[PDB]
Design a protein around this ligand. Structure first.
Ligand code: BYY
Ligand code: BYY
Ligand code: BYY
Ligand code: BYY
Lengths: 119, 119, 116, 120
């Protein structure tokens, strides 16, 4: 279900494996921002979700440092997987940059990403 | 400086190891919510932060399922670690519960936690 | 371009008047009677480089018929053109006791359009 | 207890009047960001809050344009007033800047401000 390759509305690529233990592991490649190529992600998901039609809660983190570039920032996505004919992961995210203490008020962006397995 | 035990303002306990590769691994024990005992956490941090006084960006996820309870929800914390004698991890968080599609509008809580080395 | 009736994807409606001073006034008709006062502000002199027009408004969920002891603010931007939109993120805070304040605020997003 | 002069943890000044109709009016002066002097605010608050010890929900908006400066941005604060012993307004806020469509993903900052009546 969750395991596979997903794309968000920006064209970013989220390759994830959902482990039986509730673990999420994989790579994220952002189409935007101070990022290039793949970054490691790790996360957790509800491996025993409700059976009443509710989505599956999940979250994951990317710290935007790889072998090529370091943005000194990290994003967490929090959301739920909705299965079915048109599988989607609906997320909201927080991106925090490292700042000085005086600039901490503007450290964190918020947004929302929707992932499907298409394009 | 990140590795060790941290406590937030609500009385929750965050036990974490910061790996050399940027991995965060540990356990979270929540003082509030549909939670009981320890939960696995995983996350990522900037393992090569700026040397200009900026904090160290980081994030982690807890899915609120363990051997004792399943809240069908997951929280991600996004923030930065700030060193010194009064070291802190300042975070904002998103808590998404699994919902049906009709209730997705109320799926996600937002808040902020500050973690310190002493409590 | 802001003044008029807008519809979200959830069947809510709001009618707003954008005053020359930057004021937003109108009524929000929810879906998830149900009309509530809305007030807000918008940038009355936006950039002319294709940037959106920043704006925000608040609705306190009390009227003559019910009171949910809560308030939503929407923060976003108006984007003009053929498919005009107001893209928003919102925060809904409910009145809680201090012990429950950690769970007082929901966050989401809404997109409003001039059609349907 | 909402009406008065409030200051947040940054030293910003929030001057507000709560109208009997649920209206919030006043001025906001930010200690940080692309802002100078006072800006108009408007908002709403629950004028018949619960009597069980719960706070009073409220929210307000500032568009960061005044006679001196225009940041092409607007902030909304959503929060609750908590009386008793030491009056406080605890908020979370969203600051949206006007952006191109390509830059809309980075349009919105989020944070939290706590206000008390204690001058810096
Ligand atoms: O610019 C930076 O600091 C690092 C790049 C972050 C890109 C952000 Se993550 C939330 C949003 N979703 C996405 O795919 N890319 C953007
Ligand atoms: O109630 C649930 O769904 C699981 C428990 C959630 C606890 C939340 Se995580 C954000 C906040 N910080 C904390 O330590 N506990 C609360
Ligand atoms: O349940 C309540 O508190 C009263 C109705 C709240 C409606 C919320 Se405002 C954010 C979201 N957008 C919308 O149109 N309706 C929901
Ligand atoms: O920089 C801009 O775009 C306009 C100024 C925004 C200042 C932000 Se509003 C949230 C935070 N609280 C405060 O008092 N000032 C800052």
């Amino acid at each position: 279900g969750i395991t596979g390759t997903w794309y968000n509305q920006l064209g970013s690529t989220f390759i994830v494996t959902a482990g039986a233990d509730g673990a999420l592991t994989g790579t994220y490649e952002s189409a935007v921002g101070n990022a290039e190529s793949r970054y490691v992600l790790t996360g957790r998901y509800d491996s025993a979700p409700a059976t009443d039609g509710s989505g599956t809660a999940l979250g994951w983190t990317v710290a935007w440092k790889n072998n090529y570039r370091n943005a000194h920032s990290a994003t967490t996505w929090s959301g739920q997987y909705v299965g079915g004919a048109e599988a989607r992961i609906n997320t909201q995210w927080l991106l925090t940059s490292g700042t000085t203490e005086a600039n901490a008020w503007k450290s964190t962006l918020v947004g929302h990403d929707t992932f499907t397995k298409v394009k």
